[PDB]
């Protein structure tokens, strides 16, 4: 029947990958060259804009590495965008750009440098801008990707991200794809844009809403200053507690009870 791969000799020999390599979330060859700084700069922070896109949410952060672990300085998240205007389509391309503006303008209002670095930057006797690097992650770096949508939001927000590079931006290409289903197929418009009809925003409105989204983000960027954080964290456990409790651990006494009742069927008790 051929060789059994996976003996004791296999599993004893087997080195594991780290953890977030196993869970398959970080490339550690990226990360080790994202973090590194020259030893002549010593203990100096350099910031990195994380911008990972799940389904529904576009997440965007600014991170400093430390030996204990990474530390977010400021965060923004596309489920906040209902407050500023954008009710639906929270992983659009224009939704990804809108989070880019939030991460910029919140970070600069925390550091108290809002009057400086208003527009994009594009050189002496002038204050140098924030170096913030892009962490993409395992998402593939192709042109017109939603990772670089978050980048363009951060650059137009304020921050000097280095790169080499207004359609797709105020709701175009969404708005054209509405018209192709609306005009021809009609059945498919009900499938594809169910929620949109429900509001209903319509094809034309996408251009209008985003501009006033970019107005309101630039005016009132920071939000939800909650304290203390401990009593906030306690309320979330009660608020989001499964109705059905998770199975809990059997103690060492009641395990040996159940072991023996199985062993009574096949004989030779009791022990372990």
């Amino acid at each position: 029947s051929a060789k059994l791969v996976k003996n004791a000799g296999y599993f004893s020999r087997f080195q594991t990958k780290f953890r977030r390599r196993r869970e398959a979330k970080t490339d550690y060859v990226q990360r080790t060259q994202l973090i590194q700084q020259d030893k002549t700069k010593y203990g100096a922070a350099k910031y990195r804009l994380v911008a990972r896109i799940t389904n529904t949410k576009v997440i965007a952060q600014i991170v400093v590495a430390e030996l204990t672990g990474d530390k977010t300085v400021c965060q923004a998240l596309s489920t906040e965008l209902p407050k500023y205007g954008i009710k639906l389509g929270l992983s659009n391309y224009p939704a990804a750009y809108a989070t880019g503006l939030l991460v910029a303008r919140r970070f600069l209002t925390q550091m108290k440098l809002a009057d400086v670095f208003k527009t994009e930057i594009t050189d002496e006797e002038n204050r140098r801008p924030f170096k913030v690097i892009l962490d993409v992650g395992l998402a593939r770096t192709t042109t017109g990707a939603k990772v670089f949508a978050v980048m363009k939001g951060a650059v137009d927000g304020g921050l000097f991200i280095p790169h080499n590079v207004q359609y797709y931006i105020l709701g175009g290409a969404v708005a054209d794809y509405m018209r192709k289903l609306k005009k021809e197929s009609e059945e498919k418009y009900n499938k594809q844009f169910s929620r949109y009809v429900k509001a209903g925003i319509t094809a034309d409105n996408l251009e209008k809403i985003y501009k006033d989204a970019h107005a309101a983000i630039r005016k009132n960027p920071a939000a939800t200053v909650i304290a203390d954080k401990k009593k906030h964290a306690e309320e979330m456990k009660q608020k989001h507690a499964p109705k059905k409790p998770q199975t809990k651990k059997l103690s060492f006494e009641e395990k040996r009870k159940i072991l023996n009742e199985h062993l009574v069927a096949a004989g030779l008790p009791p022990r372990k």
Partner: protein, 164 residues
């Protein structure tokens, strides 16, 4: 609903036998049938017996997905009257079968191209075989979603009204 078996794909390949303009003709046999421009297989070894070099075009092959793969099996199994052997099925519940006498599937006007025989092979899977394929959060599927051999035979009788 998400324990439904479906056809994931139907991978054709055609090896004519022997080298030359039989291979580029066998591409046109695939291209008109499948509606897809065919990938050309290269060899890995010189074997003088069968008439093969190390680096040369042996075969053509192509990978069909969606409604198109389900359509061809309906015409292809109608050659054998919806009948194949029980020992066709592999341990994952994937099966295949031969169609010599090309044109059966397959209707066409031969002139420049010859007739060339067919290696069809089907891949039955559940919904969530995304997770093995993907990059971000790659992992293994469960024991439950893995298709057994004996469940795959029950699908074949249910789907095509077939017999073994």
């Amino acid at each position: 609903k998400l324990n439904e078996i479906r056809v994931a794909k139907l991978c054709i390949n055609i090896n004519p036998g022997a080298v030359g303009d039989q291979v580029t003709r066998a591409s046109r046999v695939i291209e008109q049938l499948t509606k897809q421009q065919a990938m050309l297989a290269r060899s890995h070894r010189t074997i003088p017996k069968f008439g093969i070099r190390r680096n040369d075009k042996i075969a053509a092959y192509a990978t069909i997905r969606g409604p198109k793969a389900l359509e061809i099996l309906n015409r292809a199994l109608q050659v054998h009257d919806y009948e194949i052997s029980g020992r066709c099925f592999s341990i994952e519940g994937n099966f295949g079968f031969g169609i010599k006498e090309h044109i059966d599937l397959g209707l066409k006007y031969d002139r420049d191209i010859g007739i060339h025989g067919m290696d069809l092979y089907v891949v039955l899977e559940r919904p969530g075989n995304r997770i093995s394929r993907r990059k971000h959060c790659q992992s293994r599927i469960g024991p439950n979603q893995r298709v057994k051999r004996e469940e795959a035979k029950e699908w074949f009788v249910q789907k095509f009204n077939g017999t073994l």
